[PDB]
Amino acid sequence: SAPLGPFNATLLEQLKNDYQKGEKEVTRYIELQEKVAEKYIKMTPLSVTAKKKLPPSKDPRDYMTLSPYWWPDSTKIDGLPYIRKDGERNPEVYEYPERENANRFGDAAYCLGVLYYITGKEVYAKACANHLRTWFTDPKLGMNPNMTYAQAVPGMKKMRGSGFIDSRRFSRALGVAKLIEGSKSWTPSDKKKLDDWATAFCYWMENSTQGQRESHAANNHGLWYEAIHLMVLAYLDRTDRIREVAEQSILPKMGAQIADDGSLPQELKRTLSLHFSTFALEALMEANQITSQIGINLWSTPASNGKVASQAVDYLYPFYLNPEDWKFKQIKPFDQSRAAILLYEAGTALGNQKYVDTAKRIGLKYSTSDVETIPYLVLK
Amino acid sequence: SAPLGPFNATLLEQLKNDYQKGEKEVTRYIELQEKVAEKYIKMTPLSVTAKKKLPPSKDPRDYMTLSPYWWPDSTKIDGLPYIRKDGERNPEVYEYPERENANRFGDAAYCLGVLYYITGKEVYAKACANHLRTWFTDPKLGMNPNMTYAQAVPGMKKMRGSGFIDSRRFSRALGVAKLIEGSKSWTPSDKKKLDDWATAFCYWMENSTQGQRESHAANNHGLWYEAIHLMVLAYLDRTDRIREVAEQSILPKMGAQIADDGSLPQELKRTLSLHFSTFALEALMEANQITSQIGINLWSTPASNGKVASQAVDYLYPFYLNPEDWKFKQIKPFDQSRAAILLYEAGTALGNQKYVDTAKRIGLKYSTSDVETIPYLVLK
Ligand SMILES: O=C(O)[C@H]1O[C@@H](O[C@H]2[C@H](O)[C@H](O)[C@H](O[C@H]3[C@H](O)[C@H](O)[C@H](O[C@H]4[C@H](O)[C@H](O)[C@H](O)O[C@@H]4C(=O)O)O[C@@H]3C(=O)O)O[C@@H]2C(=O)O)[C@@H](O)[C@@H](O)[C@@H]1O
Ligand SMILES: O=C(O)[C@H]1O[C@@H](O[C@H]2[C@H](O)[C@H](O)[C@H](O[C@H]3[C@H](O)[C@H](O)[C@H](O[C@H]4[C@H](O)[C@H](O)[C@H](O)O[C@@H]4C(=O)O)O[C@@H]3C(=O)O)O[C@@H]2C(=O)O)[C@@H](O)[C@@H](O)[C@@H]1O
């Protein structure tokens, strides 16, 4: 049975099972995945330190991005302080290399780690370990275990926890490292450094002012904080903390953030309201992949006021069928294919055959190289 | 009388005239524009050679950018060939430093050239010259006079001219160079080198296969091609060619693009139809700023087919009051402020007081640093 981590363990166990049986269809699917994964074996490992403009700590190992919806104010001689245009990404975000590099690393590590679990081939673990060492634990290239300067905003006087949501890009890679333990390439010394990094990152998460603030957020930030938290705790094998987090934080947050009619009012007020309602559900989906590995179903387990996350799925389902019917401010097109993994996950967790049907009818492209769709041959 | 170039000469002469007579309102406004200008004096001049990944010619002096709506195909093992998602900018465009650096050069050179025209202070001519010399004529840092690899698309086998439209960012700076002739900093040797560059660039525009194809386009590319053409012709003082282009290319192109209702069907079929309808007129507006300096009004001169550009402004005018009423696909919000300079230019050219009154009611911010608004004190 799969090690505890940020994936649909049932679908991974089934793919590894079929690949080992020599089942034709899965075998061909995995051979395609191996072809996609060759670029990650050849890819040079990325580091948070590959930036010219340093953060106020003057430390190139400190992760730093720009908060995406903040823009220079043209009415100020220096553009300072920035102003907020909700839903409009300031392309200045791409001058911070971490932003896209954390996606490239996360994609590389996740794909290689999953392919190692499924095939057993050492070449995937060796490449995966190379990316992990460099991003996380290397004494010069490794990222400091904090998110102090994530989504900083030029001109802002107070510190914010909002940047912590960036962590989900590399925290999935943190969790997949559990899959390459036991390989020849991931030594006991490697595992200890990663362990120690995750322990220091978990501390910063729970005890820094920014972490505490992010833990109490009223919208999808607070849900994403707990999903990221679960990935860190699951890597650290702290399964009783996962139970406490789900019952003392995730379920209360779900209970407050879902209205009686199943809508998410904190997301309804955004300019990307259909996208942020989905982003909230995406946070629960990824949390649930971990909690359900220790018997906690977050789609059907009620909060203390009896609300269940499936109520939020129900409210959105008609608009996953027709995003044009969405009646709230959505200033950019909504990507309907996001409903596939979402409805499949919610649908199986709930025994809702309509959701699963709709997920397969929406579907994923068989030959897509989007790494988060690797477990989902069932949608292809 | 102002030198021939890419700006509202009436407003520019007005500003210089009031500035020299010590008029208080204009002096306070030019004093703000000099505060804004201070960053361009200190700013290090940009070069097209400041890039790591080189074009197929392996020449860093060749301008190269990515066509913004072309994305890697995830269903292909290498992502090749890219596919088009009209109206969705691919953040990969920012990995080509020329794309934003030509904007930064253009603003610096335009702002400093105009301020030197208005104030006569040699410090603006000297800084403006530094930027122009580096971007255009420097034997190591200057861009080659061609747009061969503008808006290239990975995996596409045929060459296209679509990328020429990028030239507007630096072709206005080329035009403003005329304004610093006579200064101490812009020597006869500088002017000759820039004249030879402009001559070579004009030859490339008119004779390269990509130039020819782009001069033939049936949508706003064709209009922007000609508006760029006029800037180069005006910098070279070829006023006979300016008339020929106006009468034999812009006006027939303009008339071929206007429907009976005044709409622009080539732009209505885009996913950003109100943006691109306004982008078409913006090209015509910038062409007109030059043609009218020799007595050709593109807003009111009809074409061979009877269509006149005033008809397309009439069609768009209601939706500049209320962009929400726009009935055609527009998958991002539309910046209503663009109608200020557009309606003032068209309003003044047509003697339409309603357009001019709406222009000022929409207005521009008095304190803004957007350098294209420098001449428009009347709108602030
Ligand atoms: O990095 C990305 O592109 C991903 O971003 C994901 O959306 C995130 C953003 O990245 C930001 O973190 C954004 O921060 C928001 C908060 O969610 C919140 O709305 C906050 O609201 C305040 C505001 O600061 C201000 O004071 C105003 O006057 O009041 C507001 C209020 O009362 O709520 O503003 C923050 C901000 O914009 O700085 O939040 C979103 C999010 O909700 O997750 C997502 O788009 C993802 O797909 C991207 O990849
Ligand atoms: O981001 C920027 O740099 C600025 O872009 C400005 O918009 C430009 C773009 O830069 C592109 O050049 C874009 O090219 C379009 C063509 O205009 C055209 O629609 C063409 O459509 C073809 C298509 O390629 C295909 O072959 C199909 O079968 O037929 C179509 C057809 O006949 O129309 O596709 C090109 C493409 O996308 O590559 O066009 C716009 C433009 O119209 O000017 C602008 O948005 C500006 O504000 C930005 O700063």
Side-chain angles (χ1 to χ4, degrees):
Chain A
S1 95
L4 184 59
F7 31 74
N8 187 313
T10 290
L11 289 176
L12 287 207
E13 289 154 6
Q14 167 183 180
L15 287 164
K16 173 176 187 150
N17 175 253
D18 283 329
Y19 183 83
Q20 283 178 345
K21 292 179 175 192
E23 202 263 287
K24 243 49 165 178
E25 223 167 282
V26 158
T27 289
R28 293 188 295 109
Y29 177 74
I30 297 296
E31 292 175 354
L32 172 57
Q33 297 308 320
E34 300 183 276
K35 280 167 192 164
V36 170
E38 60 206 353
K39 68 187 184 262
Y40 298 131
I41 296 157
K42 290 153 70 181
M43 177 188 147
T44 305
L46 300 174
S47 151
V48 86
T49 66
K51 52 168 167 267
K52 272 134 58 191
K53 190 144 108 188
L54 298 186
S57 62
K58 299 309 165 195
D59 191 342
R61 303 173 64 201
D62 274 343
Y63 183 106
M64 175 171 73
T65 54
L66 170 63
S67 179
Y69 309 135
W70 288 84
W71 296 75
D73 182 350
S74 57
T75 73
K76 301 262 190 299
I77 65 199
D78 48 7
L80 303 186
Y82 276 22
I83 55 195
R84 171 162 178 275
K85 301 167 182 183
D86 184 23
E88 310 190 58
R89 181 146 50 205
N90 173 4
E92 287 185 0
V93 291
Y94 302 110
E95 308 165 7
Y96 302 72
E98 295 92 318
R99 184 198 159 90
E100 286 320 309
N101 283 342
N103 268 339
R104 297 190 183 98
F105 156 70
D107 276 359
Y110 184 90
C111 167
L112 297 159
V114 166
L115 276 169
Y116 172 74
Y117 172 79
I118 287 161
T119 71
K121 302 181 177 203
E122 185 71 34
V123 63
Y124 296 125
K126 186 186 186 209
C128 188
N130 261 123
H131 295 282
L132 300 170
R133 290 198 204 84
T134 302
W135 186 263
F136 287 115
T137 63
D138 188 82
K140 289 153 115 186
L141 303 171
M143 153 187 208
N144 287 329
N146 74 61
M147 288 294 268
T148 307
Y149 300 113
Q151 300 203 1
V153 174
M156 217 190 234
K157 290 214 137 301
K158 66 146 173 273
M159 89 186 111
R160 257 154 58 252
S162 307
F164 187 74
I165 203 156
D166 278 19
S167 294
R168 75 193 190 279
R169 291 166 177 147
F170 56 79
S171 72
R172 305 176 180 111
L174 181 61
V176 139
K178 215 70 182 162
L179 301 179
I180 77 174
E181 296 181 347
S183 73
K184 189 77 184 68
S185 300
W186 194 244
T187 75
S189 155
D190 283 333
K191 165 170 163 59
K192 199 238 187 316
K193 287 178 198 145
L194 196 49
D195 282 2
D196 290 342
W197 188 99
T199 303
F201 186 71
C202 195
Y203 187 91
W204 185 90
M205 278 196 69
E206 306 184 339
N207 297 276
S208 69
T209 302
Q210 290 161 286
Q212 293 178 58
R213 237 164 245 174
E214 194 77 339
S215 68
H216 293 130
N219 60 351
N220 70 78
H221 275 262
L223 298 174
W224 272 110
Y225 172 95
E226 290 305 349
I228 293 155
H229 201 182
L230 293 195
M231 300 178 206
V232 172
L233 295 168
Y235 174 86
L236 289 179
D237 202 66
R238 299 179 181 169
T239 51
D240 282 344
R241 291 288 290 133
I242 292 178
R243 170 162 252 93
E244 284 156 43
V245 162
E247 297 167 6
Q248 305 176 17
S249 181
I250 301 197
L251 290 172
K253 283 176 168 49
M254 185 273 285
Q257 286 180 35
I258 298 180
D260 293 316
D261 68 349
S263 66
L264 300 149
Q266 301 306 310
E267 319 306 333
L268 283 205
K269 66 173 68 167
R270 308 295 295 281
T271 67
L272 296 168
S273 65
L274 179 50
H275 150 77
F276 275 126
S277 295
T278 304
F279 198 51
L281 292 197
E282 272 151 355
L284 279 151
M285 180 188 74
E286 292 194 28
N288 175 76
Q289 286 168 350
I290 288 175
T291 65
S292 66
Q293 283 168 64
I294 61 159
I296 296 174
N297 186 331
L298 284 176
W299 292 107
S300 63
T301 300
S304 61
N305 59 17
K307 307 214 177 107
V308 285
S310 59
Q311 293 177 248
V313 193
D314 298 336
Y315 180 85
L316 294 171
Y317 178 71
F319 312 102
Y320 289 158
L321 295 171
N322 303 98
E324 323 86 20
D325 298 13
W326 184 251
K327 286 126 77 162
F328 293 91
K329 198 140 190 141
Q330 178 72 20
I331 73 161
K332 280 179 37 189
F334 171 75
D335 180 12
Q336 184 192 208
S337 73
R338 287 162 71 182
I341 288 169
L342 184 54
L343 287 171
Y344 181 88
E345 285 276 331
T348 54
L350 295 164
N352 192 318
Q353 186 53 217
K354 196 188 46 188
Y355 291 170
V356 180
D357 282 356
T358 297
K360 312 198 188 197
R361 196 167 58 259
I362 293 177
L364 298 168
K365 300 291 183 279
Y366 178 87
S367 47
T368 184
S369 51
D370 303 336
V371 314
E372 81 269 19
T373 78
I374 289 177
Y376 295 88
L377 174 60
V378 64
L379 293 173
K380 313 175 175 181
Chain B
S1 184
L4 177 65
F7 37 65
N8 189 315
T10 299
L11 298 176
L12 228 59
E13 293 158 3
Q14 207 159 283
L15 281 174
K16 180 205 221 294
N17 173 69
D18 291 359
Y19 178 80
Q20 290 183 341
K21 284 164 9 180
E23 205 272 285
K24 191 193 214 174
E25 223 213 326
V26 163
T27 293
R28 267 166 19 215
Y29 170 76
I30 297 311
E31 256 151 32
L32 162 63
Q33 303 300 320
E34 297 171 280
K35 262 255 164 164
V36 165
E38 282 319 303
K39 59 180 181 281
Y40 298 131
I41 295 180
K42 296 176 187 108
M43 162 191 165
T44 307
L46 291 171
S47 169
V48 92
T49 63
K51 52 172 171 255
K52 205 197 161 259
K53 46 172 158 200
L54 293 198
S57 69
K58 315 246 159 85
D59 189 343
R61 302 171 71 196
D62 272 343
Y63 180 105
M64 188 184 56
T65 61
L66 163 73
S67 187
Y69 305 142
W70 292 81
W71 299 66
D73 186 347
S74 66
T75 80
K76 302 264 186 306
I77 305 311
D78 49 359
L80 295 185
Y82 280 33
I83 47 98
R84 174 165 179 271
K85 297 171 145 258
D86 185 32
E88 310 189 31
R89 188 182 289 149
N90 179 345
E92 283 187 6
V93 292
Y94 303 114
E95 308 168 14
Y96 298 77
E98 303 96 311
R99 179 206 160 97
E100 288 316 313
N101 279 344
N103 248 300
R104 301 185 178 107
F105 161 69
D107 296 350
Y110 188 86
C111 163
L112 293 163
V114 174
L115 279 192
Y116 169 76
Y117 174 72
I118 289 170
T119 75
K121 295 178 180 164
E122 185 73 44
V123 69
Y124 302 125
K126 191 219 202 181
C128 180
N130 277 137
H131 295 291
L132 300 167
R133 261 187 226 103
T134 304
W135 186 268
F136 285 126
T137 57
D138 182 79
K140 303 198 187 303
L141 305 179
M143 76 179 278
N144 296 320
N146 69 71
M147 290 295 274
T148 302
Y149 304 106
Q151 296 202 9
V153 169
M156 218 189 48
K157 298 203 154 140
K158 192 52 175 281
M159 71 190 324
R160 291 186 318 167
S162 310
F164 192 70
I165 207 154
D166 282 22
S167 302
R168 72 198 187 283
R169 287 163 186 152
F170 56 73
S171 72
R172 312 177 181 119
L174 176 67
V176 153
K178 212 70 183 177
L179 302 189
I180 73 167
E181 298 184 355
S183 61
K184 323 277 148 279
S185 316
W186 192 247
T187 74
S189 167
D190 291 312
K191 167 184 168 50
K192 150 108 192 163
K193 287 180 80 178
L194 192 60
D195 286 352
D196 291 336
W197 190 94
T199 296
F201 186 76
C202 195
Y203 187 87
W204 187 89
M205 281 183 83
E206 296 183 341
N207 303 277
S208 66
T209 299
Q210 287 163 283
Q212 297 177 43
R213 294 197 183 147
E214 185 84 319
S215 75
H216 294 159
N219 69 336
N220 68 266
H221 278 261
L223 306 174
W224 274 108
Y225 174 97
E226 290 311 348
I228 297 158
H229 204 180
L230 299 180
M231 292 177 205
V232 181
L233 295 169
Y235 172 78
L236 292 171
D237 207 50
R238 307 210 273 220
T239 53
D240 284 3
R241 300 281 301 124
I242 293 174
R243 190 161 250 112
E244 283 169 57
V245 169
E247 293 163 356
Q248 309 181 23
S249 187
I250 299 190
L251 290 189
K253 282 183 175 60
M254 194 64 266
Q257 279 171 37
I258 301 176
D260 289 344
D261 56 2
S263 63
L264 303 165
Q266 279 298 71
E267 319 299 347
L268 298 195
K269 70 176 58 169
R270 306 300 290 284
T271 69
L272 300 158
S273 61
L274 184 53
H275 161 64
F276 278 117
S277 290
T278 305
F279 196 52
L281 303 195
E282 272 158 351
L284 192 98
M285 171 202 98
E286 293 198 26
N288 180 67
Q289 279 169 350
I290 284 165
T291 59
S292 75
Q293 272 168 79
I294 74 175
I296 302 195
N297 188 321
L298 304 174
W299 291 112
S300 58
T301 300
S304 56
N305 70 348
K307 289 315 188 311
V308 51
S310 71
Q311 298 176 264
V313 185
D314 301 334
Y315 181 88
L316 290 174
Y317 178 73
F319 314 103
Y320 291 156
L321 283 319
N322 306 93
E324 327 78 28
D325 290 16
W326 184 250
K327 291 296 196 171
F328 295 90
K329 227 178 169 76
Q330 174 84 29
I331 68 165
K332 290 174 53 188
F334 171 79
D335 179 8
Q336 176 177 71
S337 65
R338 300 165 63 193
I341 302 187
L342 188 62
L343 283 171
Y344 182 79
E345 290 279 332
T348 303
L350 292 164
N352 188 322
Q353 192 58 45
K354 166 153 72 71
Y355 293 177
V356 180
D357 283 353
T358 297
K360 313 200 207 182
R361 169 180 339 115
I362 293 166
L364 307 167
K365 302 300 146 257
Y366 180 90
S367 41
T368 184
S369 56
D370 303 337
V371 313
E372 70 284 14
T373 84
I374 289 166
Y376 299 94
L377 178 52
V378 296
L379 286 175
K380 287 173 175 173

